[PDB]
């Protein structure tokens, strides 16, 4: 599938037997990471806040207290006790069963 990479713009081709997809990256949208991502197409793929910018290219980011990971979409707590999460039912590695 992946000879040469059908996913472009930097994305990543997990080819399969039958098929293959494009793990896409930031900035980028559509199938083969063809067209740009937009703050209205799935939040921008940002996990908290989607913004646009000078260009029409996006800009993910976070509330006071979280820090936008290096993938640039998901938000990581950046201080011990972060805003608006429950913390009894998750420490250390627990889910509300």
């Amino acid at each position: 599938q992946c000879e040469p990479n059908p996913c472009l713009n930097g994305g990543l081709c997990k080819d399969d037997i039958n098929s293959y997809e494009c793990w896409c990256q930031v900035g980028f949208e559509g199938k083969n990471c063809e067209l740009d991502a937009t703050c209205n197409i799935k939040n921008g793929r940002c996990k908290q806040f989607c913004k646009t910018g000078a260009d029409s290219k996006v800009l993910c980011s976070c509330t006071t207290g979280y820090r936008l990971a290096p993938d640039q979409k998901s938000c990581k707590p950046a201080v011990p006790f972060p805003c608006g999460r429950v913390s009894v039912s998750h420490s250390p590695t627990t889910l509300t069963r």
Binding site: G65, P80, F81, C83, G84, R85, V86, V88
Partner: protein, 235 residues
């Protein structure tokens, strides 16, 4: 909270309880370890208020409790000018000694103008608090919570006497039977997007509580958000 279910301990860690002349009088939402926030109509000339942080069963004494006393208490640059005193029903209480942040003392999240509305317009929010358990009568000792579907401007106007402007929004049940209440006043109205809960309301007033046909109404934090952002900047 009438028509709610009991909340569970440690699950609502932004739920300040505002203590003053009467004991259990308004709720509040830890905008952060040094300032909590609340409806402006809980600011009385004369009372000196005390945020009860990690509280669960009022009839009993929890190790997570952290009271402070309000060292000062801003309300918005447009509360009421003797006119209609439940519009920008909003305000910050600076605590005097900073709260020790923990799993029972945890601030709620204050998302910017553009996003707080988006969370608000997903149409169901977790309202919580120690207020009345029934319509006039019995107050919730052990923290009460409730989910509230967003109820539209056009209809909620149709249930009022009073002027519902835009800094408020309406929510509750069409089939009357469950709402916040007096004593819940100031408590939170938050929406969670995938873990992270964000504040989108101050529980404000309501032509009575949980009355079939009439709803309870809430402040539109979208508006004051930036303001909140400004004035609590520990940085």
């Amino acid at each position: 909270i009438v028509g709610g279910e009991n909340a569970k301990p440690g699950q609502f860690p932004w739920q300040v309880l505002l203590n003053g002349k009467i004991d259990a009088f308004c709720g509040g939402s830890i905008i952060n370890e040094k300032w909590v926030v609340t409806a402006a109509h809980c600011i009385e000339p004369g009372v000196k208020i005390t945020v009860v942080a990690g509280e669960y069963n009022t009839e009993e004494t929890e190790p997570t409790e952290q009271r402070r006393n309000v060292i000062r208490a801003i309300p918005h640059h447009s509360y009421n000018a003797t006119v209609n005193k439940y519009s920008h029903d909003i305000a910050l209480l600076e605590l005097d000694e900073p709260l020790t942040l923990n799993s029972y003392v945890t601030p709620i999240c204050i998302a910017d103008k553009e996003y707080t509305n988006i969370f608000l317009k997903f149409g169901s929010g977790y309202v919580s608090g120690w207020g009345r358990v029934f319509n006039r009568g019995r107050s919730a000792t052990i923290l009460q919570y409730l989910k509230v579907p967003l109820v539209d401007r056009a209809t909620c106007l149709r249930s009022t006497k009073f002027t519902i402007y835009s800094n408020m929004f309406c929510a509750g049940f069409h089939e009357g039977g469950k709402d916040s209440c007096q004593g819940d006043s100031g408590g939170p109205h938050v929406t969670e997007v995938e873990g992270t809960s964000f504040l989108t309301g101050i529980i404000s007033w309501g032509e009575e509580c949980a009355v079939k046909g009439k709803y309870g109404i809430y402040t539109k934090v979208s508006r004051y958000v930036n303001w909140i952002k400004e004035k609590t900047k520990l940085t």
